[PDB]
Subunit: 160 residues, 6 copies
């Protein structure tokens, strides 16, 4: 699995992801290239339609569930706690997905964009220290999401 | 090897699986042959008959449960979200199952067809880089759907079956 | 080792016909039990607070599967479903040593799972029945009960 | 871990465990010595207070007593004695019998059969209530008991 | 590095007597602690009732059972007797061990219970599949009237009643 | 990568005093952090309630207890004292570490709690089968009235009240 990279813009704190993937921020895990992006080691997101469970037809509108990414303790974490606790809305959250390319390197092939996100949950876990880093799960609702397969040219979107 | 390939046609978006298994869509995992089919790494489906008591035998209408497949982030995924969000009815979903053949190659031996499918759930999960435990693995997209009719076909050996998922 | 299941249905006849032939299961073909389903798992519970619980076996996508769905969805009762259990014997081969048969079985659940995002897809078949008999064929002991 | 051997006597079917651990019954896992006892690969048992005894259970394979065990379960046959002999590695090379658990007029309450597919040999969990249990550390002299 | 526990009840005399001898355990015989139960596991919780939203402090300390896990040793029938008869155990004393400078084991911590009562005995024997060193396990859970914690090597006591 | 926690109590003073010294933890002695507890695990959640099939932000944020896991060290009896007596802890300070360029551990993050209260202490010792060559674990959970987060290496801070 290749890591994804997330650029976060805040209404109060500006470029929250600024310097997130630098040596000062993440250490020997430094990634040359995405200095102003958080490196996401996990992502999860669900979208659902309630169903009757008997006829199989929907029993209500679609429901968006929070978008989540997991990172380590990087330079953005104190800023993310500020946003969570102060209710700061983020006008843009943009995740860039990567895969192994022909040349051998990673290529950006997919994009997920959230508009006016709000952080609803931050979960920190340090696995037992006796190659892994502490984990920080950031969950977010939003007002609109757009999906883009950049390499093949397909996009879609929806409001919350 | 043993992934399945799924052709999806939508009543609004046409051939949703178009080009899903091409190099631009999935990269090094592109499979020449199934260009207009989604590559599915997992599949799950349940059909059940109520028993309802210590009585112990069938007691009510059978219930079909949603059919689901899991794929990676391919060219159709934005289209699939469009289908989920707009309630787009999918007139045909066709699953082709594969196994190792006599000669050593992959063989198509089973087919599952859905008629008037509707996507009810899309769950995206990316496992983490856990020091070569998830080297082979990729982000996964579990797509679930209900339908109005299913056909089961063992193409290699001749046997077929079918059933309707009644509305009421 | 796998178990082998002969299934006879009151509407579709020998449901197990050709289940374990190369055309049905591929390189997993077993050239002994052509007309039996090869079961990779089996589970069954009988309990008192007697209540029998459904008998279950798990197979892959073999040629009887479309017929098993027909039985389930149509409520076809199966007059006999017979399990033959095997073990490796003294010399070197597998020997049949146990049989469980069900009488007037009914399929109540079919759960299909494809794994591994080097094994095979799995299909769990669960069944009620009206009578079950057990018989350690190798040792002479038998038992039976009604539902 | 070494397996245990259980001698089960039933009020209707007699020595249920008779020949349970012989060549014809369990195959290459045949170990001569406990021919008239079932070879148990697992055991679990709980007693708790808010006394409450919970069922004693053992796990075996498809052996010659299993069809008889289903008869006991299905008819409610009271089994006047159930005796488990526990074994451990000794100073020398063989296993030594060091513990015994004895139940009086047990009743089988549950039989759960499971067969897995990197594994070996299907498992059958037999659970039973009882009217009295005796615990005995054979090697050291201490005993205990209680009624249900 | 297992713990070693001494148990006395008001009716049965030294319940842990000879618990860790060959006659009691066998090839796992470990000299020295002959009259103590060798515990392979221990678990214990103490808690304060919460009130999550507008949080911190909805109640009075709650003690939960102290439990240890051993094998089938000579004290087990004695423990079942204690469980079944409701025998009050005036003292249960746990000695914790760690790697020392010398190469041997050093006793550095003690947990004491006063008027303990056995609340649960769960016996589980894992499948012979391999597990060349696994053995039967016995989880014994105890209530008590007072617990004392002592870091013997460094000092520092603490205690509380249930 | 283990973290080190300095704990100050309003009744017992420097509770973490000598927690990581030889008398306290043995050959796991750590010169540098003598007056800090060594933490193997830490867990902490902060959340905002939301209207599920509606707009997101409803209701007050909810801070949840901060937790750390250590072994049986010199501070444990004091930590039990704080739990059972409700001792308010004016400062809890966590220093997080990572591998540096030079090869040594570097301090890069700090988490501080103000007026902490211990709400839960869970002691669990694993079964010494292979695969368990490490020590007993003690989960200490605390609520607090203020927390400060600091990325020391990069210059970011944030904070909140409870």
């Amino acid at each position: 699995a290749e890591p994804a990279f997330i650029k976060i813009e805040g209404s109060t704190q500006g470029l929250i992801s600024s310097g997130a993937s630098t040596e000062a921020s993440i250490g020997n895990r430094y990634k040359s290239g995405h200095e102003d992006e958080i490196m996401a080691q996990e992502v999860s997101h669900i979208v659902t339609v309630p169903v009757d469970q008997q006829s199989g037809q929907p029993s209500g509108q679609r429901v968006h569930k929070p978008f989540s990414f997991t990172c380590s303790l990087n330079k953005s974490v104190p800023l993310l706690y500020n946003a969570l606790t102060k209710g700061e809305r983020l006008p843009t959250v943009e995740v860039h997905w990567f895969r192994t390319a022909t040349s051998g390197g990673s290529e950006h092939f997919f994009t997920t964009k959230l508009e006016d996100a709000i952080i609803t949950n931050i979960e920190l876990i340090m696995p037992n220290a006796q190659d892994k880093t502490e984990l920080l799960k950031v969950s977010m609702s939003y007002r609109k999401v757009v999906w883009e397969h950049t390499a093949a040219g397909t996009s879609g979107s929806d409001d919350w």
